[PDB]
């Protein structure tokens, strides 16, 4: 009935309270730490895979090496053209002086 059967003895499984809980949490904490440690390693290297009056240029180091006698969006300034006798970038109208200084337009530096 309601009271005929008392709860069976689980002592066999029973452990000797917050301390027990803390230990178990500590375990989860360490494991999470382990997962995270691996994460930084894996993700980093994971991402790491994708990691590696006239002008003249010789494409030094894969970029135009202007040598003469765009800060804006990266086009090639056209030498011997423009309103400042230096350069002009047909992309957005940046005029560079012979010194290569941006004088007019939207080129930042």
């Amino acid at each position: 009935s309601h009271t005929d059967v008392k709860v069976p003895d689980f002592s066999d499984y029973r452990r000797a309270s917050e301390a027990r809980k803390g230990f178990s949490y500590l375990v989860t904490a360490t494991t999470t730490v382990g997962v995270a440690y691996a994460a930084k390693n894996v993700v980093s290297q994971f991402v790491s895979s994708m990691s590696a009056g006239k002008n003249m240029a010789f494409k030094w180091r894969g970029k135009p090496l202007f040598v003469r006698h765009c800060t804006h969006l990266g086009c090639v300034p056209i030498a011997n053209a423009g309103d400042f006798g230096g350069y002009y970038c047909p992309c957005h109208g940046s005029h560079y002086d012979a010194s290569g200084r941006i004088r007019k337009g939207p080129a930042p530096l």
Binding site: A36, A39, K40, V43, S44
Partner: peptide, 17 residues
Amino acid sequence: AGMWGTVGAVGLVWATD
């Protein structure tokens, strides 16, 4: 939840390095 923002930030710095 307040500390979660903080927790994430801490781990973020680590992971981002």
